[PDB]
Amino acid sequence: AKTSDHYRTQNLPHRFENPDVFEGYNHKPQNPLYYTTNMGYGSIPPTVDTVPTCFHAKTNKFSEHLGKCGMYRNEGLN
Amino acid sequence: MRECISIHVGQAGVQIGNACWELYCLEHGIQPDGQMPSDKTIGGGDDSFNTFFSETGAGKHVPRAVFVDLEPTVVDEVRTGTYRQLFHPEQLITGKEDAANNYARGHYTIGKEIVDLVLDRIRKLADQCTGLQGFLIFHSFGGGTGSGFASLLMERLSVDYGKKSKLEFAIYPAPQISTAVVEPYNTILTTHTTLEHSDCAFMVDNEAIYDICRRNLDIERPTYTNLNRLIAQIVSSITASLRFDGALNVDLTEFQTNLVPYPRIHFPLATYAPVISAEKAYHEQLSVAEITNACFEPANQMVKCDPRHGKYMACCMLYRGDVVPKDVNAAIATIKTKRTIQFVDWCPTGFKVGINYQPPTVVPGGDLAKVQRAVCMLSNTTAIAEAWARLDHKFDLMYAKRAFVHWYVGEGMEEGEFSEAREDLAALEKDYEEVGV
Amino acid sequence: MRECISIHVGQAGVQIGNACWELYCLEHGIQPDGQMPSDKTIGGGDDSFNTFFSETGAGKHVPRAVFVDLEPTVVDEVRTGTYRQLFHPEQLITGKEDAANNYARGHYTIGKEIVDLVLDRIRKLADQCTGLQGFLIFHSFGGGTGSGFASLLMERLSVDYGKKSKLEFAIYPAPQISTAVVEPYNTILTTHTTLEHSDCAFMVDNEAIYDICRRNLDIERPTYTNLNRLIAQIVSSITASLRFDGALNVDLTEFQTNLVPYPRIHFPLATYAPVISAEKAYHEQLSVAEITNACFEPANQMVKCDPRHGKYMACCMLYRGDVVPKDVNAAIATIKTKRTIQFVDWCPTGFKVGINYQPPTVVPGGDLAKVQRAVCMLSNTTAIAEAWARLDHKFDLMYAKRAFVHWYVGEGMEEGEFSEAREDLAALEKDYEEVGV
Amino acid sequence: MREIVHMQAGQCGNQIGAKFWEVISDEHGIDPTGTYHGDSDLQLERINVYYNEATGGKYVPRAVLVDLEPGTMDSVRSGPFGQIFRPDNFVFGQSGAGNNWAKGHYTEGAELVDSVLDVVRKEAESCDCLQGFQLTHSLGGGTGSGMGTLLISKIREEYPDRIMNTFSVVPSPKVSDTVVEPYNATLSVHQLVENTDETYCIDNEALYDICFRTLKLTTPTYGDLNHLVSATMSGVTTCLRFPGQLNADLRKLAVNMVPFPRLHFFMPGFAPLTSRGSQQYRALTVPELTQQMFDAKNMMAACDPRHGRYLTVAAIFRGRMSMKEVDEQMLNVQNKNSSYFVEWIPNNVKTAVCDIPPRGLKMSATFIGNSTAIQELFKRISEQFTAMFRRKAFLHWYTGEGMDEMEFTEAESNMNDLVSEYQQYQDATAE
Amino acid sequence: MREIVHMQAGQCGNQIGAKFWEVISDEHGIDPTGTYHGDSDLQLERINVYYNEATGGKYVPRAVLVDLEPGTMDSVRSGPFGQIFRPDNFVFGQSGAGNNWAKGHYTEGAELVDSVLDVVRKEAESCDCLQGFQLTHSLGGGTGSGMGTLLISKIREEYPDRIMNTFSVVPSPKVSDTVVEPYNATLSVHQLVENTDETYCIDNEALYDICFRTLKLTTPTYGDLNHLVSATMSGVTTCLRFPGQLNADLRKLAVNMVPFPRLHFFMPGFAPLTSRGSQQYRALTVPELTQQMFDAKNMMAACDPRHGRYLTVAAIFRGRMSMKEVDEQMLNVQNKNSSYFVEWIPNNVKTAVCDIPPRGLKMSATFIGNSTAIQELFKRISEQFTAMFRRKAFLHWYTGEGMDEMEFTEAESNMNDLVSEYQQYQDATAE
Ligand SMILES: Nc1nc2c(ncn2[C@@H]2O[C@H](COP(=O)(O)OP(=O)(O)OP(=O)(O)O)[C@@H](O)[C@H]2O)c(=O)[nH]1
Ligand SMILES: Nc1nc2c(ncn2[C@@H]2O[C@H](COP(=O)(O)OP(=O)(O)OP(=O)(O)O)[C@@H](O)[C@H]2O)c(=O)[nH]1
Ligand SMILES: Nc1nc2c(ncn2[C@@H]2O[C@H](COP(=O)(O)OP(=O)(O)O)[C@@H](O)[C@H]2O)c(=O)[nH]1
Ligand SMILES: Nc1nc2c(ncn2[C@@H]2O[C@H](COP(=O)(O)OP(=O)(O)O)[C@@H](O)[C@H]2O)c(=O)[nH]1
Ligand SMILES: [Mg+2]
Ligand SMILES: [Mg+2]
């Protein structure tokens, strides 16, 4: 299923646009008792509904690339 | 480059870590294997994960967390749980004995032989860290691991690192509801150590969360799952300004230095609004004015401490969602014009607002409503001395006839230490009423 | 823009609010689930709902009225019947204990454990506004929740909101027909707190509406629903000028300053015309002059006192439907030329006429016919002095040997309170007769 | 959440409360095995008033039946709707009551009352509201009088602000059936006056008369009587249950009933009552219902209210009806029989209407008449007690278990001052 | 890894430890042979607390069984779940016990204890990290009060900082079964006080009362009594073996319960106890579970908790619950009766909750009380001892074997000093 024919999508990545690519969110236990409440944080997977509709994450490629090399220094002869 | 190492100490620390790393992974779209999903070949422009996870040489995500608990049950459950592939194996550090609600046992015994390994893992994380904005330590004042080992760990990070911030999320005991018995002793003894080695000392009380869940969420039977999800939402809304961009970004140093007037009032008070449920939240606008007016209420506090018996010294407000600065400023103006909120005389301009475009990411199966606006409000009210007055009352009426003290004096705790901690906290609350008046 | 927040206290209040909001939803075209059905996009404006119904971001019409009772029976019936998703969950506040026709019980021991929550909900509803116009309170003078808690609620409302209008709709005990024994006690204790400390108070009996339903509607064994519908029609005709449009509208704060002369005389009486069934409505010539002269008929009032034995001090006459403002003046002239209808000497002009364009709606399953023009004639006069004289007679007769007073003393209220309220109402009777002469 | 714990003292109380549970379980839709076999949603809405809830959707009564002889437990458990009760709520003793107030109060009832209070406290504050304590008993016998009054005293000491209803089967002179009935009644009304909030007294003579000449049954053996009593119980408690247009709970009745604190002895009546031969011939309109309600031959007390004066009158109607018919009838009965109403209380009648009728008929009503004619039973019991206390008759059977004559004399004095109190408002004036 | 070494002693100790092992092997899913036919991995996650690995996957309990006669060892080995134990730690003697404290502490038992300590050192250094030892003696025999206290003294002197948990069955006023029982109890409690971290004293009369009231059973025998004690054991040490929510091990209980070092005599209770027919009518949730903990009828010590003040109360709950509900219930019972609670320890109920219920019932709880009501039982034992000792009755055996009367004098002196220590923190106020 898509979160586009069902919701509003604003520049959301493909990772959240298809919530079916999420695996490992089940981990079904043994026989249904011995069901400690602490392992209830690995509950039901994110789906088309409980997914972010907006992803406003900054990108620091330019800043990181300039920060590794270093800022400008007055080096010359004039 | 902005990166925060989280240290989760105690059983409360490990459960907070579970319910907060679940929210972090589910917000950044990382499955519990630690594996980043299909990015359509080219990875693209996305580096919000860098504040909590690191790109290894495979495309995986190992979190910047150190889970420490002396008792090898709650952390072995995480090692056998659904998030077993997330954490590095030499990050869920455990011992073989317990500290058993004993500050002396957690500080001068078995908790001591593990602090070297914890510091070595912290050193490795800081070495692989480029820019360390601040450590983020989650524990409880119940006792044992959460007080003695947490105090020792804070002292050791203070003496080795220094400078860099150390935010603290401490679970605080209630006026009436309590689990352990030597909780006033363990909480008095740890204030002496969390005073001069903490930069912010956020306090959460369980009874306030119970009342909040029973009143606003229509759940008659709350538990630690809901408690730690609320605390996870608090810390996620605090730290979201790093990972997700916003107008008026407020990062860790900024709301550290715009929240504390003096280097003895560094014990803020969190509040989340809305904490409403979905069936109720169907019938409101959830406007900015509404979610600000339903945030200074004494019924929505997080500590069981009504701020009417005190003055607000500082107030940071982190808005998270589709909020507009015009409505933020109108809400601030209305809050200032209302008379019941008494701000202190030497701070006419105390409000630090921070906007983030990202709405709060709902966790499926949770009890909270799923809405496009939220506020995490960090007050610095002078009313916080009420809890410490009740703490002194309980400590005095236990220490009048030396109850429960033989365990401490056998495992450490020269008998003047209790009196020293009592004197320090009494002088501190004297300082708090001094800055209140 | 023009808000009319309602509070419905007591069982009579909750039932009359059920009928009132059924009428509001049917005349605003809102289905009981909150949405607006039948392809809402037709029409450009239709902002008439923003007096009684709010509007969330998703666009739901959420009403502005708090249904408060101490027993959960009628409130749970509302929560389980038809209008279920329309009201907010924190809008139907209920208690454990009942007030049990006991003003002292509902005012001093049970009323104070729910008053903070109802005032907080009124706080939230008033904050969800853009400038409030007037509170509409609905209760019965039979006693209990409708008298004592209503009095305490009005006291705290007058403390909180300064000079906002607080219009009462009181179910006053009829001369002969009544359903309790301590109703004179409750009315005497309630008039003290609603006289000097509340705004204009519309007051209706029950047997007058009983006789009207017997005669006009030609219906012989109906129940309280066919009284609550008529009072809902009256209150709709009162506060319809805020929502709808028409020539010479009458604002809610302009009702008071142009009806009640002195700030102790604020007890007018209502009369709705023409109440009629369909078979009788098909057989006459419903017109402005006819409904005007049928308003002043002493057999059509909703208060059992003859206005022929009193003085007409002022009259605000509100019209709905196909009414031109020339037949209104032609009817006022032919009323003022009649000698039997007697006006007080210091009042040459005694009429405030107002006109609203849109005709009164017809409820499905009702008994009123599809009327084209209607009047809610609201007159301040001196005829209710006889009714309060009769109630003074009943209260003095029962208080002669201290019947039923041991309860009120038992949950705590001094015996001098009854004498204080009795002498207050005696001074009120003196005030009415000296105004009349 | 308003809710009553129900407790039945004595063999009479146990049977008359077993019939009460048998009729209200049928009213609420509960089967004999304790599950909800009900059709309407409204039946399982106020079931917390009288029932708890166990695992598997099983509803148990909140009944804490107490006796001191083991045969009555067999008689209440072998009957229908008998297995529904919790077996922990069956505390009793193996001794013999002896029809002795001294035995049931001081010697053998005092040993059991600690465990009885334990179970009553558990079933009472394993709760949230706890409005009512309904004890049901007979005056004149043993544990119905002594054990019941001791239980009333201890419970009123424990909970001083909760409603105390007592359905008391006061003895009648024509029925007799026991020679120590005046002793037990006169010695138990002392505790019933100072403690209970509402006490409804029921005459077995009146029950036999209403079975003879109203129900017209040839042999009303032992169950028609307590069926009528159970119908009256359901009528007076229905307002905490299925919602109506104008309801009135136990406090709403009690506030509007008693003018003065020691006037809480009531004469009940449930009169949509017709024989099977006339049920096809009579209508069931509100005027017919209220005229046979105010008819004195449909009263569960042997006192004729014409020889007296109504202090207050209740009318709890059940059924969907018109409230300016019931109200004009309540006004019409006052305007007609104005001489039998006290002149210093205008509007002596309190009216409540619930819209859900009992199982059977579509309309019903319950009458509670606080009148100054109830002193006839009290005067006759006082006369029969003072005709026996002169020549010390049957007195060693109380002094051996241990009582002085001062207790008997103070009980007779408290009898006589209450009779004089009712006579005071029988013969009085408005001003 | 935490672990508990079990040391059983006496006929009572061997029987009750055999019952304990055959109920916790069923809890962990262990065959009588010793093979895991379980159904989950949480059973094998912490199986090393009680079992030692063998070749192939067989599990051998870490229990050392001690007696002075062959007797109960042969009975247990012939009985079911007798083939699971190590055959090399069935150490016994060929002599007799004589139900004599002097014979158990100074005669031939003083060289059997060398072999028992050799076996215990083998089972202790064949390990990684001892949480401690538990012992289950009888307090009134020659082996329970003899061999048992000698084992406690040797273990305390050799390992000084490990948790010692001795359960022990205290004598009773009625139901005695032994004539020198006060002598053995008084001589053994003196060694219990200075050498044991904590004791969970249990009374046979209270167990019989629990069976005759709650769990009807007609004939209660000893299997059901040992089942109750074993359920108490498995309830109190369940957080060591099963993970979940906020948990508490034995050292955490020790540091929370005992305020001052000679005050570690605890008053236990298991409370999902319901009758066979009452199970259907029972509801199972936290409030009624709480009141069944705080019911004096469901206590395994004969002392009345209303005859004293609770110092501290441990509540070890098991099952998926709402710990908001359990904390609210603990605060509610404290605020309900704050009279039976010390003022100088505010909110003195240590609470722990685990998420693994025992087999059968859905929701469990274990009550531990460090009450000041045990001083009346201790005063009673001292009264029996001094009444027997004023005439030097049954003392010639002890003196002829060789113990001076100074030892009995110090036993009675420590007896009365401990009674006074319990007495002062009952009327000691805050300020
Ligand atoms: N909010 C919240 N509080 C918790 C949670 N778990 C434990 N606590 C608090 O922790 C207190 C108990 O002490 P702990 O912090 O658990 O002690 P510990 O971490 O187990 O360390 P030791 O006592 O040495 O075993 C209680 O009073 C609780 O308030 C949790 O999951 N959420
Ligand atoms: N006109 C009208 N009057 C009503 C209605 N319902 C109740 N009343 C009046 O209310 C009076 C009794 O008081 P209630 O309103 O029923 O009681 P309350 O205000 O809920 O407080 P309590 O007595 O504690 O229940 C009666 O005398 C009736 O005249 C109604 O639906 N319409
Ligand atoms: N109406 C009615 N009266 C009863 C019933 N059972 C007994 N009585 C009357 O109560 C009196 C005996 O009371 P009893 O049951 O022995 O009281 P107890 O000794 O406490 O059990 C007799 O005179 C009967 O007339 C009953 O089921 N219904
Ligand atoms: N709970 C329980 N108690 C027992 C059992 N057998 C004996 N007892 C109690 O133990 C006491 C006798 O102690 P005993 O075992 O003979 O001591 P020993 O002679 O040294 O072995 C008696 O008072 C019994 O009440 C049993 O199977 N279960
Ligand atoms: Mg721990
Ligand atoms: Mg009502």
UniProtKB/TrEMBL annotation, chain A:
Main localisation: other
GO terms under cellular component: axonemal microtubule
Q: Which UniProt keywords apply?
A: Cell projection, Cytoplasm, Cytoskeleton
Where is composition skewed (Basic and acidic residues) in this entry? 3-18
Superkingdom in the source lineage: Eukaryota
Q: Where in the cell is it found?
A: Cell projection, Cilium; Cytoplasm, Cytoskeleton
Q: Identify its protein family.
A: Belongs to the PIERCE1 family.
- Protein known as: Uncharacterized protein
Give the source species.
Strongylocentrotus purpuratus
Shown part of the complete sequence: 40 to 117 of 123
Automatic annotation (TrEMBL), chains B, C:
Record's subcellular location: Cytoplasm, Cytoskeleton
- In Pfam terms, one family for this protein is Tubulin
In UniProt terms, what function does this protein have? Tubulin is the major constituent of microtubules, a cylinder consisting of laterally associated linear protofilaments composed of alpha- and beta-tubulin heterodimers. Microtubules grow by the addition of GTP-tubulin dimers to the microtubule end, where a stabilizing cap forms. Below the cap, tubulin dimers are in GDP-bound state, owing to GTPase activity of alpha-tubulin.
The GO molecular function terms of this record are:
GTP binding; hydrolase activity; structural constituent of cytoskeleton
Taxonomic source organism? Strongylocentrotus purpuratus
The UniProt entry's GO biological process terms, in alphabetical order, are:
microtubule cytoskeleton organization; mitotic cell cycle
Among InterPro entries, the record links this protein to:
Alpha_tubulin, Tub_FtsZ_C, Tubulin, Tubulin/FtsZ-like_C, Tubulin/FtsZ_2-layer-sand-dom, Tubulin/FtsZ_GTPase_sf, Tubulin_C, Tubulin_CS
Q: Which family does it belong to?
A: Belongs to the tubulin family.
Segments forming domain Tubulin/FtsZ GTPase:
49-246
What keywords were assigned to this record?
A: Cytoplasm, Cytoskeleton, GTP-binding, Hydrolase, Microtubule, Nucleotide-binding
Required co-factors: Mg(2+)
List, alphabetically, the CDD domains matched: alpha_tubulin
Domain Tubulin/FtsZ 2-layer sandwich intervals: 248-393
Query: What is the protein name stated in its UniProt record?
Result: Tubulin alpha chain
The entry describes its oligomerization and partners as:
Dimer of alpha and beta chains. A typical microtubule is a hollow water-filled tube with an outer diameter of 25 nm and an inner diameter of 15 nM. Alpha-beta heterodimers associate head-to-tail to form protofilaments running lengthwise along the microtubule wall with the beta-tubulin subunit facing the microtubule plus end conferring a structural polarity. Microtubules usually have 13 protofilaments but different protofilament numbers can be found in some organisms and specialized cells.
Coarse class of the primary localization is: cytoplasm
What is the catalytic activity of this protein? Answer: GTP + H2O = GDP + phosphate + H(+)
Q: Under the cellular component aspect of Gene Ontology, which terms does the record hold?
A: cytoplasm; microtubule
Instruction: Identify the domain of life.
Output: Eukaryota
Automatic annotation (TrEMBL), chains D, E:
Q: Residue ranges of the Tubulin/FtsZ 2-layer sandwich domain?
A: 246-383
Is Transferase tagged as a keyword? no
Question: A Gene Ontology biological process annotation?
Answer: microtubule-based process
Q: Does the keyword Cell membrane apply?
A: no
Q: Any idea where this protein resides?
A: Cytoplasm, Cytoskeleton
PANTHER family, per database record? TUBULIN
* Role of this protein: Tubulin is the major constituent of microtubules, a cylinder consisting of laterally associated linear protofilaments composed of alpha- and beta-tubulin heterodimers. Microtubules grow by the addition of GTP-tubulin dimers to the microtubule end, where a stabilizing cap forms. Below the cap, tubulin dimers are in GDP-bound state, owing to GTPase activity of alpha-tubulin.
This one is known as Tubulin beta chain
Phylogenetic classification of the source organism:
Eukaryota, Metazoa, Echinodermata, Eleutherozoa, Echinozoa
